[PDB]
Subunit: 430 residues, 4 copies
């Protein structure tokens, strides 16, 4: 139905600067992560290089924002990259040089934006491109983000509002942006879901003439607005910010269950960025500091396995260049990725005593089974072939291990440690 679905036929895969560098990533760091992606990851589907929040804030240095500070901005109330952090933006060029480079590696470029219009634009009453009204005239008088002070909300009822959003995406399209992550737009302690601005953004993107994938954050996204999100966004966060803490991983199983019927081509409920590898370099969120992920290997696999079978977007959050061989291996298994790229129909077969089984399939008849022990005790996790919809014996294969497992006659069953999972492919026997 919606033409923008075609811009994310499979769930976006990429890297994002938040979990490693907070609000404070530099051009060099972005370039380095992109080169690593081009060399090691691109053949496996990884393509978006996403510069997260506050690229326009020259003093940023953490995940903790510096409030009420001046921001880099043009003459039409549009935020611009901080030239100290992004030297190629010198001379009003913005992100075009960086995006060109990223494109020339065969990759795509993404940026984060905050909903609304900068508070400094409203206070100075700076202009809006393509109209005579000023920033001050389109601002909402009672709309802010509770966790960031950079913007005021824009009031769609005002003349000039749509013109401002159109102008942002004209700029982003000039730069060659392929992906935008909009924040303060879905969940808000204060206001709930900013529906009208979602619609203005959809329209601005559609008018800008370039394919720009739309990601919405933070969650929890309400199910009440499922139609709105399905029709307007290519991805939307199911959850508040995800981090390397078991509790949050445990909690994702329920959210996936809740959203599984809205997952489809072009429209991807989002389990959030993968806190893997080296994170917290200039971030202080998630209760950690400079570290390798606190997920155990079993946990890392369990996460990847859930996000894969569910078909969450996959946005690696660590500094890629500090990957070890284990971490890289999680990203380069073609057999596992097939489940994410070509699987469909994922569903929870059952959840009982903190054992969970999910299943999906491909069009070639392969069935994929993810089996999870999310309890604190080692146990056998099993599922009958009948509950999977398989009426005869099947062959099984362990996709992470790339190992044939042999014939299965009545049930799949595996000993799994606490927090441990397995991902299996079933195919006809003999």
């Amino acid at each position: 139905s919606m033409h923008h679905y075609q811009w994310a036929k499979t769930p976006p895969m990429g890297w994002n600067s938040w979990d490693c560098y907070g609000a404070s990533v530099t051009e060099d760091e972005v370039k380095g992560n992109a080169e690593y992606m081009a060399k090691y990851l691109k053949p496996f589907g990884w393509e978006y290089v996403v510069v997260d929040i506050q690229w326009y804030e020259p003093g940023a240095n953490s995940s903790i924002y510096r409030p009420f500070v001046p921001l880099e901005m043009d003459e039409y109330s549009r935020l611009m990259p901080a030239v100290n952090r992004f030297p190629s933006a010198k001379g009003g060029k913005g992100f075009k040089p960086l995006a060109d480079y990223i494109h020339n590696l065969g990759l795509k470029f993404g940026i984060h934006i905050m909903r609304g219009i900068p508070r400094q634009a409203v206070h100075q009453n700076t202009p809006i491109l393509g109209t005579n009204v000023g920033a001050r005239d389109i601002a909402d008088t009672n709309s802010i983000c509770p966790w960031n002070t950079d913007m005021y909300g824009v009031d769609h009822r005002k003349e000039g509002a749509q013109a401002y959003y159109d102008s942002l995406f004209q700029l982003y399209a000039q730069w060659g942006v392929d992906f935008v992550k909009v924040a303060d737009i879905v969940a808000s302690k204060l206001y709930g879901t900013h529906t009208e601005e979602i619609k203005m953004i959809r329209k601005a993107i559609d008018r800008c003439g370039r394919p720009i994938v739309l990601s919405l954050s933070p969650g929890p996204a309400p199910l009440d607005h499922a139609t709105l999100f399905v029709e307007n966004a290519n991805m939307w966060r199911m959850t508040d910010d995800f981090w390397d803490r078991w509790e949050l991983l445990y909690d994702m199983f329920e959210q996936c269950y809740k959203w599984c019927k809205l997952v489809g081509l072009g429209h991807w409920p989002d389990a959030d960025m993968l806190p893997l590898g080296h994170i917290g370099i200039r971030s202080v969120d998630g209760g950690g500091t400079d570290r390798m992920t606190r997920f155990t290997k079993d946990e890392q696999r369990t996460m990847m396995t859930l996000w894969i079978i569910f078909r969450s977007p996959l946005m690696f959050g660590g500094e890629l260049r500090d990957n070890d061989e284990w971490t890289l291996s999680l990203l380069t298994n073609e057999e596992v990725l097939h489940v994410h790229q070509n699987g469909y129909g994922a569903r929870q077969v059952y959840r009982e005593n903190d054992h969970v089984v999910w299943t999906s399939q491909d069009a070639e008849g392969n069935q994929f089974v993810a089996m999870f022990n999310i309890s604190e005790k080692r146990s056998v996790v099993s599922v009958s072939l009948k509950d999977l919809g398989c009426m005869e014996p099947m062959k099984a294969r362990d996709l992470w291990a790339k190992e044939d497992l042999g014939l299965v006659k009545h049930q799949l069953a595996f000993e799994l440690g606490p927090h441990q999972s397995i991902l299996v492919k079933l195919s006809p026997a003999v």
Copy 2:
């Protein structure tokens, strides 16, 4: 197609239900008369379920207003049974089997309403449960009632004997030949919200009983938060609180359809509720009316049918069918319209603006259906471009309700529509 029970409702269930016309109080003769009418005039068009609504076990029921704290007919295993004064064929412990046999012999299916839980009287007396030696009292929830009816207490799934009781109900219903159950006090509750555990117990009881029994959940509003649960466990679930012949409720349905449109699919049908058409309120007092013909105008009646058709709501006629006039019958028996319900898919809201709304769906044959609605208080032209419908070339247009070719359309559809008026159009490729 994960769930086997989806095959029991491959298209949205179509039938009649006794609530809007007879409240809690329908009799056997009334049910049979409505079934005979269905068999004769409606069955070849898809209409097949004959559904006895709430309180068939309350011999004194006489209205849509319940008589609270009264005794109920019940067998020796805490299971509610039909009131024999209202359903004489149930004499001698036969329950609904004779009435269901009669209905089946007309080529129709038989449905009943149940209230969630176990009868209060069974819990106080501590009567037995079939297949276990715990009593009714031991499976009841100590803090779960229905705020608008006093017959039951909720059943606590953590108690031994709970599943056994629900299994035993569906054993009984399968013995009778029930093909459809509408469960009430299960989805929305002022007091408790959604009774998820009992939904699951019911799903299991039905799956164990050995007979196809379609599952309908009521009342709404169903929360989207539980979309997965409903989609996987029920064949239909009410999007709204009880729907009646009042414009305000019909107006409100537009939004609910928008909110639930992505969960509509084979076997799992969000439910816009029964159709308050024809003669209603005979022994019902709800909806702010009494004995009457529907207060919906013909325009409103067509707008309702048009939304429910394109969206693919189940269709449960609520009036006393034998009193249908030609107009009312015509709303049920337009083959071209019903093709949209039976063979359309992908219904979506194209836009809603200034109380004008357009919906569209399609079939596999290259037709596109467009429902255009003026839901404002003023007469106005409602339009939609072919481009917004996804049609790249000119199309032939036809008015489905009027069965009238409208000719070639090159750029847009546009019609003058009165307030609360609509039109349903098929677009097909030009010659």
Copy 3:
């Protein structure tokens, strides 16, 4: 009476407030005119506060509707100041001192409105705070605004310099001679609820400034959950969102009085809000009206006065006083009625039934006051037994508004009252008294 500031409002504050008549936009001349009228006609009856309501620091204000994100008049220490166009005497950095002096010289007191917090323009520029080296930006709350006015941000009590800022405000206001402050966006908020920490900072600032400044909190509805806080920190606090000349709001006030009646006492007055009497809406567009004489009927005006009087609400007249007619003035100058407000205590709802309500209070001389109200839509007799009032013997009765003896009452008070009509009666002993 354990808090010293109770002594600053031993009886409920009485005065005039520029909001209902001029919105945010009152001028120096208008303030002076109202003060002069108060001095001449009202002062001997207890009316003394002359209160300049919101946005005296906004030079372009012209309505009850605020002009958002506009520059505000401010000094070099992030403190808002009077707009010199609207208040010419404030020229040369003098602020309100001249205007306050003039009011004081009439034998009156001076009040102003403030918005909770620190001006957004101070925070964005990071202007200084008097008495510290931290800037305005460093004391702001990052997630605290007012949902209906854009002038400020909230101040975060946990930050060094927060208290110093509020201290500096009340040093300024004390210099000017302010005797009363109404703080807004402090009690009820759609977004944040009650700003308790700032209430406490404001209490402390006032206590440190060395001058008696009566503290009024607004808007309501004030939650009972914070009763102790309000009782111990404020002299008055609004029970209700903004009150206007609409019967529905007057009807509603009966319940709020009932809910707050036990917290009424010397120095701490639940507030039923300003009296929309006389000429209002001159440069205000709120309450669903424009330039008008109050839409309250005479009966309704009396009913309002009678409830606020017996309950002991503060009395803040909201009309332009100089356009008072005789009738309106008469509502304010009845000493017998005012005695109930000044010297009554123990007010309570005797009953409320079928939209008939009776309240009673008493004085220390054993007089008993009874206010009887028909708040229904039909004319009816409203009555109450002497027994229900706790009177054990027959009493003499007097109609306090009419100043008319009603004679002896043996068993009950009863009066035929039109819809929205009320009566206020004094009962005094007959036994042991001459004839």
Copy 4:
């Protein structure tokens, strides 16, 4: 203003069977506790002997109710004492013999009731005394207690409703009841505050011709209904059920602060029963079993001190006959009790860093000060005489220790362990 205030001029003091015997106390146990009270406690103000919930449930055996069971009841839908548990009730005499016994010890008798009318009376449609209506005709069809199944609410709009409540208090007056604790009346997860039944009960009591003190439970009582409670009840629970757990004692400090201005002659916000001594004998609530209170001595003193100065009612919840000398000493200190009986004006002077100070005074100009360390660390807690409103030097006395402390010029200050407090009387010097 309200005549019933004269029935509780000081906060009621007594014993209640709940914390020790749950719903299941017997006649002998009540009599034993009463005899103890008469012998050891009565001269110090302790007088009420209160039979708590479900005296009408013959099978009761715990604090956990047996749900949906038949209940002992007369022909007029009125619950009656279970004769197995209360043998003197044999022959329809109800609690009159027991109350007479208690009265003959110079004590007062109290019972607990649940709001409403018994479900069994509604289902059988038993009569209401004095009318031609039945129980079924006065019941609310959507009003239950979420934590007990014995009753349905009564609908005040129905003919007979008042007549039912009048009949209950006629019965209770016949027995000689002096105090009724009504439960399921103030806070309800499901319905909030049952204001209409509070008013019917007030009226029923006023019509019965006997002084019956009215206690409402459980809390938390909403301040929003302060007036209603102040004018209709003699006591009302500030909190959900209180037990011997520090966390709940800590929490009470705030509730006292919130309610302190509504405390006054005849109308006492209620901090709930004192879990002292031997409790949990046939109760399983509070996360304990058969035990001596888990409160440390300091905590016990801290509890007593706050309840005393605030002027909460004092209802001892242990089995009195198993008291040791320590526990008894908490109940028989006249100097401390004077603060409860004759103090007034209690207020929180401050609360800072988990140190709290309260003060009140008497009419002779004595000033009482309760100083609490409610933190986890030993520390000095202090308060200036100026903050107390004391203008000159004062003599100080430790009321619990009965020890003169000497002259105090500027401040009171004491080293206090965590959870420890002290109670001091200040009086004029020389």
